[PDB]
Amino acid sequence: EAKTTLFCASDAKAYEKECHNVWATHACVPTDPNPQEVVLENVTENFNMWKNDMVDQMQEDVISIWDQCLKPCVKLTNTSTLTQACPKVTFDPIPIHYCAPAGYAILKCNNKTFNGKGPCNNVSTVQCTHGIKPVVSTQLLLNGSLAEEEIVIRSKNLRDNAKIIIVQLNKSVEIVCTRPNDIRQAYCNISGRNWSEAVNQVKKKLKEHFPHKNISFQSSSGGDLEITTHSFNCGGEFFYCNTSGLFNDTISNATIMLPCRIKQIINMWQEVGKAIYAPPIKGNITCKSDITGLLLLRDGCDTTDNTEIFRPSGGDMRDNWRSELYKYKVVEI
Amino acid sequence: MSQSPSSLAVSVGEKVTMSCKSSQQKNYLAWYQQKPGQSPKLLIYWASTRESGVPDRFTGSGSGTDFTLTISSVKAEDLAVYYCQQYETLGSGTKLEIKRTVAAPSVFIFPPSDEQLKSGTASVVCLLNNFYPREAKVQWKVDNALQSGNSQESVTEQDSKDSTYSLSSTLTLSKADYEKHKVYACEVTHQGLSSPVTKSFNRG
Amino acid sequence: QVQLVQSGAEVKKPGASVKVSCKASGYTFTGYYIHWVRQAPGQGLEWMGWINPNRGGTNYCQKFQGRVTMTRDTSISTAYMELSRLRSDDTAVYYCARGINSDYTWDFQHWGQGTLVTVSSASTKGPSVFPLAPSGGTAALGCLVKDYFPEPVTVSWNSGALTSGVHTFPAVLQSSGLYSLSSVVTVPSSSLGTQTYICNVNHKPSNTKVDKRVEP
Numbered sequence A: 001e002a003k004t005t006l007f008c009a010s011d012a013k014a015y016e017k018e019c020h021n022v023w024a025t026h027a028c029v030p031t032d033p034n035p036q037e038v039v040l041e042n043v044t045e046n047f048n049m050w051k052n053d054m055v056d057q058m059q060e061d062v063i064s065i066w067d068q069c070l071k072p073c074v075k076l077t078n079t080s081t082l083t084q085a086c087p088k089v090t091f092d093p094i095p096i097h098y099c100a101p102a103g104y105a106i107l108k109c110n111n112k113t114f115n116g117k118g119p120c121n122n123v124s125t126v127q128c129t130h131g132i133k134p135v136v137s138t139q140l141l142l143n144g145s146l147a148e149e150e151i152v153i154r155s156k157n158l159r160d161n162a163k164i165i166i167v168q169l170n171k172s173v174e175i176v177c178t179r180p181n182d183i184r185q186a187y188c189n190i191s192g193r194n195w196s197e198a199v200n201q202v203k204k205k206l207k208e209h210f211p212h213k214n215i216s217f218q219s220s221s222g223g224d225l226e227i228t229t230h231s232f233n234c235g236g237e238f239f240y241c242n243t244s245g246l247f248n249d250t251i252s253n254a255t256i257m258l259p260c261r262i263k264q265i266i267n268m269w270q271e272v273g274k275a276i277y278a279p280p281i282k283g284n285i286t287c288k289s290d291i292t293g294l295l296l297l298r299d300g301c302d303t304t305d306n307t308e309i310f311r312p313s314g315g316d317m318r319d320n321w322r323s324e325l326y327k328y329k330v331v332e333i
Numbered sequence B: 001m002s003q004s005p006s007s008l009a010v011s012v013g014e015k016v017t018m019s020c021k022s023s024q025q026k027n028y029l030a031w032y033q034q035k036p037g038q039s040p041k042l043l044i045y046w047a048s049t050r051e052s053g054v055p056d057r058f059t060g061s062g063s064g065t066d067f068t069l070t071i072s073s074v075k076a077e078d079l080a081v082y083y084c085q086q087y088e089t090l091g092s093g094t095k096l097e098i099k100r101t102v103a104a105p106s107v108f109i110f111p112p113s114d115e116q117l118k119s120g121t122a123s124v125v126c127l128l129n130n131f132y133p134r135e136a137k138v139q140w141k142v143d144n145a146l147q148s149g150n151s152q153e154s155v156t157e158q159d160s161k162d163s164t165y166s167l168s169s170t171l172t173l174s175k176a177d178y179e180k181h182k183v184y185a186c187e188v189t190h191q192g193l194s195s196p197v198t199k200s201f202n203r204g
Numbered sequence C: 001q002v003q004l005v006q007s008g009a010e011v012k013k014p015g016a017s018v019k020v021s022c023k024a025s026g027y028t029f030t031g032y033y034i035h036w037v038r039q040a041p042g043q044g045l046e047w048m049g050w051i052n053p054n055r056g057g058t059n060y061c062q063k064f065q066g067r068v069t070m071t072r073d074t075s076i077s078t079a080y081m082e083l084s085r086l087r088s089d090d091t092a093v094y095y096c097a098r099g100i101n102s103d104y105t106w107d108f109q110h111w112g113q114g115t116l117v118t119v120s121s122a123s124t125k126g127p128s129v130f131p132l133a134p135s136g137g138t139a140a141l142g143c144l145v146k147d148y149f150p151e152p153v154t155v156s157w158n159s160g161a162l163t164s165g166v167h168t169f170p171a172v173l174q175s176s177g178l179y180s181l182s183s184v185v186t187v188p189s190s191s192l193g194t195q196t197y198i199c200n201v202n203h204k205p206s207n208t209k210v211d212k213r214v215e216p
């Protein structure tokens, strides 16, 4: 068990002009055509998704990606000011495989209910991870991997209300966010039947850890607009979507409409600062994404109405990468 | 949570043992001390592990739901309230009281200032300084008539160093009612005093 | 060397609101969570919520949800706690606190000096200091900080020079709805003609600063 420099592999096309492909062709090797999965029999090993150097390396990679794809027109730090050309690019997250070099391997937990911390019994070793799309988002985890069995709750400590709670669903819900053609007014559509169906399943899973308690979903307690709305990048444009209608206890059965705004000034997740981008492109901007996870925080203090309240959160994208690298770990031979 | 005892009383050179019980794989807890009038300070985290600067006499212990803080050889600076904190919940607090030898009160009296008499009211002050124990019976009387219903008193927390108290009584009256009488006395009754000490003035 | 300096005392009428500030220094302000805990006079500590100064995320105690708001100002490394729809219950000393580290921030190693928040319909009024002159051996002298509101009044002797033997008594609420305290020092009578003694009284709510001489 040690730390070493990983490398990345992708199906990037040397002729495709989408920026993620152009970056991956420069920093990632081709996808290994013959992946070797090796199942260790009757072996248990400890994992800890919350202290995993792989997440910090993926973070450094996505910063390099964005430093090349989504160059801001102006970058403001309390110790630096940058003004540069900011040409629009094609933007669409592609899956990225992370591989260990010689003398190292990647252990993979095949236990379908592992919560991300502790011993795993169905351990296997691989050379590379599966395909992971580097989707930057808040509140809602998008385009990740699903749970193979049932909904998995992951937290460094569920009893600590300051620790983020990562939820992984076993069946995605579709969200379609479109800006038709106020040039910065957008909206999202999501099936209320499938969302209420998903909220009730997450509530049932949370109740197993907090029995005798009512589980309530409410809106964010506050903060920057990045974490009080579902923020995300769609085709190079930054969407900020109101999720007050999703984290409700009175979810309607009809289609739910989330009002969004496209913004040019964004608070950077890569570092402390603000990044100013050019106005939005013209035309129809549409992203149909799969909600495959949630980022929640639980209200502190003891209840007086026997109700635990969970609110969307996020902001540290390392938690996004943990929602996919929980089952992996780099070990020395 | 449930901290016990709610009130403890000992003397210098003893060991105290305050408990902190919990409800329902994480031995995590903090202990705080609050000197009188000061903000709480931290002197034990993660169950054991005394924070830097705490002397070697404090020691934490326990596991599961029952935790304990044990003070070897209680000292003056050790007189204060002690809380236990589990994540966001805290205990009821335990006020640590210190016992010491009986001390006679140093009694003093002060008449109203002329700057105050020029306003309209008059305030006579009687001070008991550095005595043990807390209770004392202060009696205000003009000439030989005792006053009642117009005399408020206060007491500071037990001094850390010498574990003593101090009491300040203030008799409020009107300037007219002040210059009406002429003699003012403050008689105190305390265990450390064989006879009630009466310090007085007579200026009116 | 980490320092947390909070705002001055506040008097508020019921149904109003108060915002207490807590300025941090000596460390990276955005790297550590910051908590707010209040303490009613004569009671225990009560946790209210925490705020993440990096991104601004907050978690409020469910008891105060709806009328508590936590904010930050990264450019000045200052966190704000605002409580609205005030009540006589909310009369308390409000503290900001910071953990030992970011991973485990519930071990409050650093605290502010506290911000007292008094809730009553009475208004602000400065004190009036009167000397308590003494009359061999060791004598005693002091002053009488009378008729002030709200509670916090700090007193020093000779600009903080005289500290040993000093006893500043707790305030008492008079029948007129005004507080009154006394601050005395034990000094030998062999210095009541050579050494001079001045009361340094400070009432931050009314910005009153007074120096009063005490002589026989």
Ligand SMILES: *[C@@H]1O[C@H](CO)[C@@H](O[C@@H]2O[C@H](CO)[C@@H](O[C@@H]3O[C@H](CO[C@H]4O[C@H](CO)[C@@H](O)[C@H](O)[C@@H]4O)[C@@H](O)[C@H](O[C@H]4O[C@H](CO)[C@@H](O)[C@H](O)[C@@H]4O)[C@@H]3O)[C@H](O)[C@H]2NC(C)=O)[C@H](O)[C@H]1NC(C)=O
Residues within 6 Å of the ligand: A090, A091, A092, A093, A135, A142, A143, A232, A233, A234, A235, A286, A287, A288, A289, A290
């Ligand atoms: C999570 O996962 C889902 C599925 O993988 C993603 O869905 C993709 O999202 C991207 C970006 O929104 C889509 O890329 C865009 O698709 C649109 C339609 O694609 C084709 O439709 C016509 C008609 O069939 C085809 O003829 C043509 O080949 C289109 O490619 C396009 O309208 C977009 O076109 C772009 O044109 C110019 C230059 O190319 C750009 O400047 C514009 O910005 C514009 O984007 C673009 O190709 C992709 O198609 C979606 N795939 C599917 C299956 O739905 C989610 O986007 C993803 N969520 C996040 C946050 O990444």
Ligand SMILES: *[C@@H]1O[C@H](CO)[C@@H](O)[C@H](O)[C@H]1NC(C)=O
Residues within 6 Å of the ligand: A039, A110, A111, A122
């Ligand atoms: C993992 O899950 C079950 C039992 O743990 C088993 O059937 C399965 O074969 C294991 N994975 C592999 C590759 O065998």
Ligand SMILES: *[C@@H]1O[C@H](CO)[C@@H](O)[C@H](O)[C@H]1NC(C)=O
Residues within 6 Å of the ligand: A111, A112, A113, A114, A115, A118, A119, A120, A121
């Ligand atoms: C997966 O890991 C958890 C550890 O808590 C264990 O409870 C569970 O039984 C494991 N799954 C299987 C099929 O053993």
Ligand SMILES: *[C@@H]1O[C@H](CO)[C@@H](O)[C@H](O)[C@H]1NC(C)=O
Residues within 6 Å of the ligand: A149, A150, A151, A170, A171, A201, A205
């Ligand atoms: C997902 O898990 C929930 C319970 O956690 C269950 O109700 C649901 O049927 C599962 N969905 C699938 C496709 O297995």
Ligand SMILES: *[C@@H]1O[C@H](CO)[C@@H](O)[C@H](O)[C@H]1NC(C)=O
Residues within 6 Å of the ligand: A191, A192, A193, A194
């Ligand atoms: C819910 O999800 C399933 C599979 O994606 C889909 O068939 C169904 O139409 C969705 N529900 C609604 C109301 O669209």
Ligand SMILES: *[C@@H]1O[C@H](CO)[C@@H](O)[C@H](O)[C@H]1NC(C)=O
Residues within 6 Å of the ligand: A211, A212, A213, A214, A215
């Ligand atoms: C709350 O919890 C109890 C079980 O603990 C359950 O029976 C009840 O239906 C729940 N009420 C709501 C509104 O969820």
Ligand SMILES: *[C@@H]1O[C@H](CO)[C@@H](O)[C@H](O)[C@H]1NC(C)=O
Residues within 6 Å of the ligand: A228, A229, A242, A243, A244
């Ligand atoms: C989201 O919508 C609800 C109702 O319109 C509103 O209460 C809330 O303030 C909105 N949040 C943001 C960030 O606009």
Ligand SMILES: *[C@@H]1O[C@H](CO)[C@@H](O)[C@H](O)[C@H]1NC(C)=O
Residues within 6 Å of the ligand: A216, A217, A218, A244, A245, A248, A249, A250
């Ligand atoms: C859900 O939103 C509606 C307003 O659209 C509101 O009436 C209701 O109180 C919300 N539920 C919760 C738990 O906040």
Ligand SMILES: *[C@@H]1O[C@H](CO)[C@@H](O)[C@H](O)[C@H]1NC(C)=O
Residues within 6 Å of the ligand: A196, A251, A252, A253
């Ligand atoms: C769905 O059915 C009706 C509206 O058609 C509504 O009253 C009910 O609350 C909804 N039930 C669920 C589980 O969403």
Ligand SMILES: *[C@@H]1O[C@H](CO)[C@@H](O)[C@H](O)[C@H]1NC(C)=O
Residues within 6 Å of the ligand: A078, A079, A272, A273, C027, C028, C029, C030, C074
């Ligand atoms: C901002 O300025 C403060 C003080 O100069 C400094 O501590 C900090 O490192 C700077 N950068 C930030 C907050 O990102």
Ligand SMILES: [Cl-]
Residues within 6 Å of the ligand: A136, A137, A138, A226, A231, A232, A233, A238
């Ligand atoms: Cl974003």
Ligand SMILES: [N+]
Residues within 6 Å of the ligand: A130
């Ligand atoms: N997979």
Ligand SMILES: [N+]
Residues within 6 Å of the ligand: A222, A223, C071
């Ligand atoms: N805000």
Ligand SMILES: [N+]
Residues within 6 Å of the ligand: A001, A331, A332, A333
């Ligand atoms: N190994």
Ligand SMILES: [N+]
Residues within 6 Å of the ligand: none
């Ligand atoms: N430390």
Ligand code: NA
Residues within 6 Å of the ligand: A082
């Ligand atoms: Na640069």
